[PDB]
Each structure stands twice: as structure tokens, then as C-alpha cells.
Amino acid sequence: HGFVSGIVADGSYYGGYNTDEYPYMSNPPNVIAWSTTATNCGFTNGTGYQSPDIICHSNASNGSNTAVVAAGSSIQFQWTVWPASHHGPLITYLAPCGGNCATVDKTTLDFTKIAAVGLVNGVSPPGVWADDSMIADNNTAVVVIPASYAPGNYVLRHEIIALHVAGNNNGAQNYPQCFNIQITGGGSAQGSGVAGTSLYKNTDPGIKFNIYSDLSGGYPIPGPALFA
Ligand SMILES: [Cu+2]
């Protein structure tokens, strides 16, 4: 599996939380990325959709730094690697920190879906998905912060849901990665957010989904509605 090793945010590179290195330090470095204990490169499945682990991954603790990002600009998430079998959507959220993102209680965050891509070509199951486009693009996912989004501090929660086992109850594998950003801009728009532990249920149609059977009915991307 992969994790996000860094991001390019409004033109500038920020190193992420190197989960294969930083957990083995008594004094890990400051980063905009949240720490996790997911040293096995693992995931949170449906057994943890109501655990705080779903918010920013296993045992996640606040990143200490925050990246300044102009509204309307692009963020690129650099994943270390991604397996071809792990087809699924890429979903990205913003939750206001109401203060410094370095100290917000992650369980109080209310996430707004700002980007989501799912099934691209279902003609030949298991199909071609957003993560396959990410793989082709140097293992990099891309999102646009809405130009109209209200300035302030936000947790940016970027996630792949791998669906290779998702026909099973609790089979979908969620890979959330969180980063602190401060948006600047001239807009005032903000979505109505959803608590991390309310984003997904193991019975949801976009969670318990068989990618190996006929895909002509499409894929309903899970989670709350996309910000408009
Ligand atoms: Cu796997």
C-alpha cells in the first residue's frame, strides 16, 4: 500500500507524515500532515467507521504546521505507490478548525466533500477508476480548492477507498490522510459539514459494492454530498 509522502499546495512542496520513518522517532519533526500509527501501511475498514480512527487514520494526532493556500489553487497529493488491484474512488474534504488546526479536537471536525472521483470506465470489470488515473499521473491526486471558499484554517482530508474486497461487509479499505491548510481568498462560501464518524456506514451502496460484476449501473460515490 501507499501513504501520502508530501503535497504541492499552491505551488509549494510540503513534506508529509512519513509513516515508515517518523513513528520510530521519539521526537518526530513538525509537518502540516497529521501523525498516525499506520506503520503497516494499513487502512480503516467498516469495523472502524464509527471509531475516531476514520477521521485522519489510526490514532491520528494533529499536525503542528499549517500550509497557506490561496482559494482557487490546486493541491497535489503524492502517494508513495498504489497497487493496481486496489481500484476505488478518491475523495477530498475540508473541515474548519475554528482556530489553530494544530490544537483542534479531530472528533469535532465537520467535513465538507470538495472533490470526488469514482468509476471512470466500467466496460470491463473491475474497471478503470480515479485511483488508476492517479497511478498514471506519477501516483499523484489533484484537487482544486474552490475559489469561493471562505478563508480560514481547515483540515484537508484526502482519501482513497480501495474496493477490491468491498463486496464483503467491512471489506472496503479507507486510506485517509490529513493536512492542515489556511485558505486565503475573497469568497465566503462554506459547506455544511459531516462528522468524520458519520461519513460512511458499512451498509452504504458505495461501500458494500462488487467491482467484479456488471458495472453498467455505475458507482455511487459514498459520503456526504459534493459542495456546490
Ligand atoms: Cu491491500
Side-chain angles (χ1 to χ4, degrees):
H1 301 149
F3 62 92
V4 172
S5 61
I7 75 173
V8 179
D10 200 3
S12 181
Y13 180 80
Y14 295 85
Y17 187 78
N18 289 347
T19 198
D20 69 326
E21 299 172 59
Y22 295 173
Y24 313 101
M25 303 175 177
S26 59
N27 186 17
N30 294 344
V31 48
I32 69 168
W34 285 49
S35 61
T36 79
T37 58
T39 52
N40 57 359
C41 308
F43 49 80
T44 306
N45 68 26
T47 68
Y49 286 173
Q50 295 86 46
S51 164
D53 284 349
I54 195 57
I55 300 161
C56 289
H57 219 314
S58 192
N59 303 310
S61 299
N62 304 53
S64 290
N65 291 339
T66 298
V68 187
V69 180
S73 67
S74 275
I75 298 176
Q76 299 177 75
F77 303 94
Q78 295 174 357
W79 290 85
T80 52
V81 72
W82 200 251
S85 66
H86 286 37
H87 298 285
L90 273 48
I91 314 175
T92 305
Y93 300 86
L94 288 176
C97 296
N100 194 344
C101 297
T103 61
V104 68
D105 182 331
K106 67 181 182 184
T107 72
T108 70
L109 295 168
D110 286 350
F111 294 95
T112 294
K113 178 185 278 169
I114 61 155
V117 193
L119 174 65
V120 181
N121 186 352
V123 302
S124 289
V128 181
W129 297 71
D131 80 293
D132 298 296
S133 293
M134 176 266 296
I135 288 168
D137 180 43
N138 186 41
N139 295 317
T140 300
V142 190
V143 306
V144 179
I145 301 299
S148 65
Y149 227 77
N153 299 325
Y154 296 86
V155 173
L156 175 66
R157 179 188 184 280
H158 176 63
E159 180 180 42
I160 305 171
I161 308 178
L163 302 175
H164 55 292
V165 190
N168 305 109
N169 207 32
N170 303 317
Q173 296 174 2
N174 295 51
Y175 298 80
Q177 298 280 266
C178 290
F179 312 84
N180 299 332
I181 72 174
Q182 181 180 340
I183 296 175
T184 63
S188 61
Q190 254 194 78
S192 182
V194 175
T197 54
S198 289
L199 292 173
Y200 309 116
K201 293 186 188 302
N202 60 12
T203 48
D204 289 349
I207 295 293
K208 200 182 186 184
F209 186 90
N210 181 7
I211 68 175
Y212 306 102
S213 296
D214 195 327
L215 295 170
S216 62
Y219 171 74
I221 300 177
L226 177 69
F227 170 76

